[PDB]
Amino acid sequence: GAVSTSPTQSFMNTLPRRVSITKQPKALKPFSTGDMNILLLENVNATAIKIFKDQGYQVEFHKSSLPEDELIEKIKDVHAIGIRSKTRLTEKILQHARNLVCIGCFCIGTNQVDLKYAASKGIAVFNSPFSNSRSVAELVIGEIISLARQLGDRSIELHTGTWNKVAARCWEVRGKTLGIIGYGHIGSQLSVLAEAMGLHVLYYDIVTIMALGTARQVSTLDELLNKSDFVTLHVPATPETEKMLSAPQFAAMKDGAYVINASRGTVVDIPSLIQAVKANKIAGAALDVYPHEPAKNGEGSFNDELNSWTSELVSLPNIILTPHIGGSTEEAQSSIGIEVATALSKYINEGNSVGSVNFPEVSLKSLDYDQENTVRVLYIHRNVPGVLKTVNDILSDHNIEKQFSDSHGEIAYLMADISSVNQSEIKDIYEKLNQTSAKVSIRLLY
Amino acid sequence: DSFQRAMNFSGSPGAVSTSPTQTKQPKALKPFSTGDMNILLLENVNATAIKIFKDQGYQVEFHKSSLPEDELIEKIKDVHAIGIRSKTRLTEKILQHARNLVCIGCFCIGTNQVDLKYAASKGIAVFNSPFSNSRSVAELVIGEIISLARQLGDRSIELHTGTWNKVAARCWEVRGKTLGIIGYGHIGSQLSVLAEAMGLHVLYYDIVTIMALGTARQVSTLDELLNKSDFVTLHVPATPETEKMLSAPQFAAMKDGAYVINASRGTVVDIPSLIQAVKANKIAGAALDVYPHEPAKNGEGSFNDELNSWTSELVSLPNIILTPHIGGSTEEAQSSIGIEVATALSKYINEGNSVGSVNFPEVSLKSLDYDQENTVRVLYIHRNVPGVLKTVNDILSDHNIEKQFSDSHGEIAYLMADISSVNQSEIKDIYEKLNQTSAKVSIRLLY
Amino acid sequence: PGAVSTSPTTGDMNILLLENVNATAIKIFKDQGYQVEFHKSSLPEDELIEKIKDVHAIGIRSKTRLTEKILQHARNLVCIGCFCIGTNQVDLKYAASKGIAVFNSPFSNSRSVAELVIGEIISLARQLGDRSIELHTGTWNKVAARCWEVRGKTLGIIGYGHIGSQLSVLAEAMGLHVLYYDIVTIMALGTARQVSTLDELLNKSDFVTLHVPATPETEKMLSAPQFAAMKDGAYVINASRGTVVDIPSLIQAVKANKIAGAALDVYPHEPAKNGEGSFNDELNSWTSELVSLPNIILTPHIGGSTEEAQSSIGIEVATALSKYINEGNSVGSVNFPEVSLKSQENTVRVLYIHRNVPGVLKTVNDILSDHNIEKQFSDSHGEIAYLMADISSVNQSEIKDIYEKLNQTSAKVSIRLLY
Amino acid sequence: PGAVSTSPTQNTLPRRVSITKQPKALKPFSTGDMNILLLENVNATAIKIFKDQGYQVEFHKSSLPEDELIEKIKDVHAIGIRSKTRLTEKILQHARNLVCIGCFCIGTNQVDLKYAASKGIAVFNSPFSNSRSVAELVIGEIISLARQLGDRSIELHTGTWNKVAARCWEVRGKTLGIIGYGHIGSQLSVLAEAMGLHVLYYDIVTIMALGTARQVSTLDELLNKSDFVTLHVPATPETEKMLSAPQFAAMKDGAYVINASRGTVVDIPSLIQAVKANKIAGAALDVYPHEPAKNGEGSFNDELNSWTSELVSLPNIILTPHIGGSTEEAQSSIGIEVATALSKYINEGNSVGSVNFPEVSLKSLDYDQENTVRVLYIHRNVPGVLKTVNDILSDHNIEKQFSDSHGEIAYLMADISSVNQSEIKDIYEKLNQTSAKVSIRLLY
């Protein structure tokens, strides 16, 4: 009835990637310490080895994990350690790590590390949560097509001599609808690929999320299950996602629809999927993840003793099974290398703990090249009253340009930039802070 | 002199200048011959075709496979149109018995299963569907690119037999990789756009200069494409030049750990040389939809050393995807073929329209309006000799001819004429006169 | 879809060009080797008569009247090019009666009009015209009130034809939502939506624009009741036809602050020529009223007045006349049957224009019966018909014989043989 | 002869709603109600955001005489202005309660930023809210100039019918040269491509193109190859008169010039001369070297800019009075940006995006952090102040703390737990009598 102001809101005025004309960051070196020793285990990617050697750190590399007694001896001298999933950094092991500044988990998982014990010794732990997104999104595009045309079945037939040309119930993916459960890093990336392959994209999330492209958020999962040809899961493991696709969800789906799970091994009830496929309700499925997975690669590893429905699952048509290869590419392993090595490096060189999984997240803008006589104090301490009183007293002869402290449990982390400090005064500040009683670990960068 | 004002002509001062630019209802018609229309459909044509024919009111007989030769002969005696696919062989042996047949539908690309020349000689028009499977093949390839990049087939076969084998080594994200398309035709150009959207660089080789879609680039030699591509895929016709165009020297021109995809034609790759390139770790994987020798029917021991001798060798190799000519085996493709060919046969029967025919002159005329009473359409198939239009236009000379179109194709020609103000007495007279001209091959009148 | 299911899917030829047709046309004709005479305006009737007695093709635009009085003297004329949409300046029936084919350019101005509208949308949304007129007379008047970003607003297109569908894609790219009303079901481009009633479009649109023909149904189709159906402070654009809007009712809707602005390219009465006192109360009585209103953009029928449009007309019509002369192709002709044939030695093409009566193909195909006819196409248009036949193995002696025989048939209107 | 190998690897989320813990809402100590004063007809979106916080809001459509402004500002905690209200030291000296200033506009020169910072007063503005509005204006002027729309309409409004297709063009296929590929330039780029123009841009920085725009290394390459040239640059000494006689000579015959950036960036006498010589076919100007302070009837004339009578007598010139950002949507977005900024500064102490202040903020306290106070301590960047402050707070655990400096001023923000109402008053009075203190608030 009246022309009127459109819904416009200022955060939608964006700017493309450009080159700053910044001032050179001052490079900072620790007090009293010599060479940084990095130990990398479990065949971390060469991108990581390179980033560390270019800093001038000494790097020791291993393709697998170490026996516990060998790991103990090596870890005594080491300043940073990179691991993946199979190295268990327990208190038994970390108690001997007198020099360790940080731990890199070159992977998503961090449970192999006793995070709380580590924090208690002032050891920051970093990981790579989102480095595998593109690899999983592409896997799914490939499985959509592969399921749509029963590729796996065709190839297995031909490899054993059966020629079975079938158009019945095989589809062009253009025009079909993809239902994405969880519009996160993977879900939103998959959305754009799926639209490019000519699918209509619906998504269900527990949060209101701005769509990419022409994807549509649906308010209930049953709308998504009702209207989707392909349903795919990109959710975390929570109690709410635990078995969130079970018999009633498969009944809500279309006859001859398809199910894809490269999220978490718990999110699908497999006995109910097996039964939905056997009833010809579900036309095919692709699983990358299972309730129980072997610890190592091997030849009889995937069987009825690991998951009891294995012999049933294997005997079904149009089932694609993969052994957790969602993120298993050279590009992903290489990006993890860069993300985590860069993270450890910024923590060592600048004290930046943003993205740490067990630590307060603290950082400060870099000092300029030309800020002569400025020191950065990195003070990890016990989260009790009276500690900033102590510290800011010790530093009170010098102007503090800026300072940031934050806490995480029983631990806290102060970072302060102080100006006009000569080398005599630096040694004095170090020894004073080193004999405070709240101190867990201290480092000064100059 | 006037050659400076000619190099500063196709160059310019600098001037703003013009950019480089660039209802009535159809009357439905029925033949003069009594007894309707029998359609025979073989080899499991799609339901879209069955529906189009029944809605015309034709009597339709449907079969899911082909017939023995003796059964096919007896059925074809009464039939007015026959739909087939690749495995029904309409030889002269069979078509000699087809006294009523007006047209043949090939619900597929190939027409070699039909003796097209014998058919044309009897005034039988043949129709097919060349370009209906394009999207289906392009999507197959996108899926095999990813599947090969990630060794999906190998992973699944392992797990189905109980082997857990997680591998990132030489498994890749296809974003950033380069796709080399050999043959930038209907399928190649479609695949190009998909591949860019999946974040591949696309190069293509063709024997002709073709305008790129998107930001694909044409390379002048195949070896440049083989040198620069991570994935190589073939979308070419079967010519003597494409016969074994990827052999040992082309695999040596390719990258270490590159990939080969062939959903074009069974002859275009030399398989013993591919087997050898894979065994030497030169080629990291391959997907084949088509083979030199393919079984005639689906079956359990059909794909073996007796059909192609290197079968047992090929199957024992890692990261090999084998499919049984399923490039165009989708519901959407089979359904579009259904509609294209059944619409074509239907317009040929109801209106005489032979456009898109593979063995016939291509002739058609605008539909007559609903309300054009007393108008007949003459469909006269004859021998392409002088003096035939003289004869025909004489026979019709008492009636105004609203329009007429004749065209020739070899020894056969096809006249189509719309004549107004014709009563039923005069119609029978025209029919019997045209039916006893000596140039006549077959005649039909629609009113 | 409650189950996964299938998805949807030659230097003898004299050309005379009048009224300043575009150079693209002059070039196409000279590259054929035709002799070309060009004029920037039209000719007096007596001069036109003398020139036309030898002309084989004539190009005109809107102001040259090819009456029977003039065409009766055109002994050589094969065809007429209208380098424009309109053809009423030509007596089409008399022309057809002499075997003269007439061609025009209906759809060459589509992009030019669609861009004009995108510009007027923005200009009206921000009162640009008013701002500039103010400043040109010294008034500084910065105004944000009721001025809008077009992003998010809705465009209502009446008539989703060549112009409407082109405008649709532009408007979406500028971030408008597009609704359209047409009297026919038309598949949308992009994410435009067809609305089943005009009143729904008027109710839901911020900008309303007209791209319809002049029919009795479009005659004054936007009047007082349609402006009442529109939003307060909505906008009206008419670059279709001068009759389609009731202007006194638009004036009244603007005066009542119902309509916030309007752009008109077309009027009920327009001057014949450019001039200084041409647009006034004697031409349309509401002129002084219309002019005194805020946020009204007035243009003098410039919707298709670009270099690119004039240039495309040049190419379309000159190519058409050229294919008619060189190949007999009459497809796109406005007053003639539409006939053409796919374009070695010893083949002739017979072009026989004749009276549409029985017995004529009998006569003609008799005359040609010593020679094989490879193909042949005849069609009719009223009292006239047009045969085109390709005959093989013909030497120049036999060609002259066929010509003289066809030239003395009684149904004949005009004949030409191409070899 | 090649080897397949790792691609060159370079993950966001789309905007989403948080399902965190409910933010604890915080109220200042010694203060009662927050009074907001809004001048110069700020948009209703701002009035609404402030009343929903429960602030008392006084609104005016214009600016105030200096003596009235002085009296009102004595009580006021936040003031919103636009370009014409001059907040000098003369006026701000009497601002005993003022916590912050909103500039509901891009410009902040009307405010004495340094004096303000010296009294602990944070100033906020809206730099980039007008981008889309300017980009659309330009698309409209491109078309309007290409078709001489303005000239046609002026003619008809006076009774002249003048149909012209000569040197009138479809913009499809033409080239747009964007000088300054910033917020406006990059937005315009995408629009222009959609209207079928080829886009070149010149910038002093390497900027990744949107779409199929192409960065050119020199300005004269852009001037040489463009049909339409448009300016979206800041006022620097390098942009001062950056289009003058030599740049117009580098441009195409019958090309077009658009300036909705800054009033100084084009040399107008040289543009007038290029148009008169038929070098430049048309121009649109939104901005001038001298502009009137207010709307009025004889404001734009030879006394303001001497070439006015010359400029106005030329064909195909579009003149607008600084309306690049004058839309409902732009004014409304400014409303939201600045009112939200002032509100977060008042309610949470967040000074990020401040133009004259250290940029400090802390994650919100949870609903269930009972007995926590937030200390907002604006002081002098001199040694020994954190010693004093962290001493005063040393009976309480500090959960977190962030101090940063900007010249002679610094700003500490500290979250302290387990504080009852007795102890809160004690901390306030101690911090209020520290010698480094400029201003202090506590939120609890």
Ligand SMILES: NC(=O)c1ccc[n+]([C@@H]2O[C@H](COP(=O)([O-])OP(=O)(O)OC[C@H]3O[C@@H](n4cnc5c(N)ncnc54)[C@H](O)[C@@H]3O)[C@@H](O)[C@H]2O)c1
């Ligand atoms: N298969 C593999 O090898 C592999 C590799 C990488 C990641 N992953 C897994 O994939 C999943 C997604 O990774 P990501 O980075 O995209 O996650 P993300 O955290 O970026 O996003 C997950 C999404 O799930 C949504 N969500 C949470 N609970 C939900 C619920 N109950 N219903 C619906 N939506 C819900 C969240 O709102 C969010 O949008 C995780 O489980 C991750 O560990 C697996």
Ligand SMILES: NC(=O)c1ccc[n+]([C@@H]2O[C@H](COP(=O)([O-])OP(=O)(O)OC[C@H]3O[C@@H](n4cnc5c(N)ncnc54)[C@H](O)[C@@H]3O)[C@@H](O)[C@H]2O)c1
């Ligand atoms: N696998 C299947 O089920 C299936 C399905 C459909 C089509 N096909 C086949 O795919 C192929 C492509 O079909 P299309 O529709 O895209 O064909 P098309 O005719 O449109 O394109 C083929 C292209 O190959 C080019 N070409 C020919 N010889 C070449 C050579 N020696 N080197 C490089 N380029 C060459 C041609 O110039 C042309 O541009 C054909 O063999 C067709 O039969 C297979």
Ligand SMILES: NC(=O)c1ccc[n+]([C@@H]2O[C@H](COP(=O)([O-])OP(=O)(O)OC[C@H]3O[C@@H](n4cnc5c(N)ncnc54)[C@H](O)[C@@H]3O)[C@@H](O)[C@H]2O)c1
């Ligand atoms: N101003 C100019 O200089 C200029 C230039 C070119 C064309 N035009 C005119 O613009 C108009 C549109 O031209 P076009 O090329 O798009 O024509 P078109 O014939 O392609 O489009 C007309 C459309 O309007 C629809 N329509 C007809 N009557 C209708 C009605 N009563 N209500 C709603 N829809 C109706 C038709 O079905 C069709 O889709 C015509 O009048 C044409 O002559 C003007």
Ligand SMILES: NC(=O)c1ccc[n+]([C@@H]2O[C@H](COP(=O)([O-])OP(=O)(O)OC[C@H]3O[C@@H](n4cnc5c(N)ncnc54)[C@H](O)[C@@H]3O)[C@@H](O)[C@H]2O)c1
């Ligand atoms: N007319 C109005 O009402 C109005 C409205 C909004 C903005 N503006 C003005 O428009 C301009 C653009 O605003 P914005 O938000 O895009 O600015 P921005 O700061 O995002 O972009 C300016 C761009 O200019 C580039 N640059 C700087 N100096 C340059 C030079 N000498 N030559 C070329 N490029 C140069 C910068 O690198 C940057 O990319 C500013 O002057 C702004 O004040 C005017």
Ligand SMILES: O=C(O)CC[C@@H](O)C(=O)O
């Ligand atoms: O081209 C002309 O002569 C102007 C009028 C023209 O628009 C027409 O009648 O189509």
